[PDB]
């Protein structure tokens, strides 16, 4: 066994494109529409609950997720990839901030952390 894929699966093509990132963005394009609007006294995030079956209880599938008491997230693209990113984002808000400074991270820095996790899946083996 052992993970013997210790090399990048995302590489530069002769044109300077990173194929796997372009194809990831294509997967997002196929994703259901989600939007965000910033007001003076708040922000709104919204999306469609595209129910796979009417027998499915679409309430049990949360597309809009609390990350911290003051930070929420919505997505377009692959749901399972989002669900694990929400789990990592919630944890990193504690391990890399709240357990050090005794307060929840500011929006831009939690975004920075989520961004870092996604960058690593773009270069790691």
């Amino acid at each position: 066994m052992t993970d013997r894929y210790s090399f990048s699966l995302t590489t530069f093509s002769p044109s300077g494109k990173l194929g796997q990132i372009d194809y990831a963005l294509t997967a997002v394009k196929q994703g259901v529409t989600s939007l965000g609007i910033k007001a003076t006294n708040g922000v709104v995030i919204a999306t469609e609950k595209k129910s796979s079956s009417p027998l499915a209880m679409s309430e049990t599938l949360s597309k809009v997720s609390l990350l911290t008491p003051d930070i929420g997230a919505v997505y377009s693209g692959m749901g399972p990839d989002y669900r694990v990113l929400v789990d990592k984002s919630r944890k990193v808000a504690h391990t890399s901030y709240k357990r050090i400074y005794g307060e929840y991270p500011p929006t831009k820095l939690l975004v920075s952390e989520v961004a870092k996790i996604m960058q690593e899946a773009t270069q790691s083996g």
């Binding site: 357990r99 050090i100 400074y101 005794g102 307060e103 500011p106 820095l109 920075s112």
Partner: protein, 204 residues
Amino acid sequence: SDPSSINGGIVVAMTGKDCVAIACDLRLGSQSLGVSNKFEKIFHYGHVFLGITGLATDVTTLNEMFRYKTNLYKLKEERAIEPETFTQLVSSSLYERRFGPYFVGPVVAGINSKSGKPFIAGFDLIGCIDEAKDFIVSGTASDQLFGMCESLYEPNLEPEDLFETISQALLNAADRDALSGWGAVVYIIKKDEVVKRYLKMRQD
């Protein structure tokens, strides 16, 4: 033998009306031998002031460590760290060495730049926070400082009155401690001006 009383020295912090004061002696020793009379124990990272008593090598190390951490904080947060937040960072940092601690008595003093609220805090060597309204004391003459502060202190002192109170609390406490004295510094901290005064005291 006791690491917290090899080098000696004291810090005291007090709150006043729209101001805080933090003061320290200037002595560094090897037990009975005085080595330096220019060992300042109060540092500042932006508008947040940190006094550190105890083992001098740890005082210097923690100053360098918190300069490091507040520099990275500022670059990422795009703003100076606040007293409340820095207090949590000092606590976090000390408790990560729970079973091999720095032999120090840190004291935080500063004014929150947004709320304007005066803030002081003290810590044991493993990062337990004492967030007193009135005053914080640390060092080899902490008993003497507790005595002086508990009688001399009254709330809502004006900056120039608070200066006299904290000065007389430090000086008279130091003069009853063998390992404290050899000069003293007092910081009077207001929202957007800080005055630093070196006190004249007995040099024995």
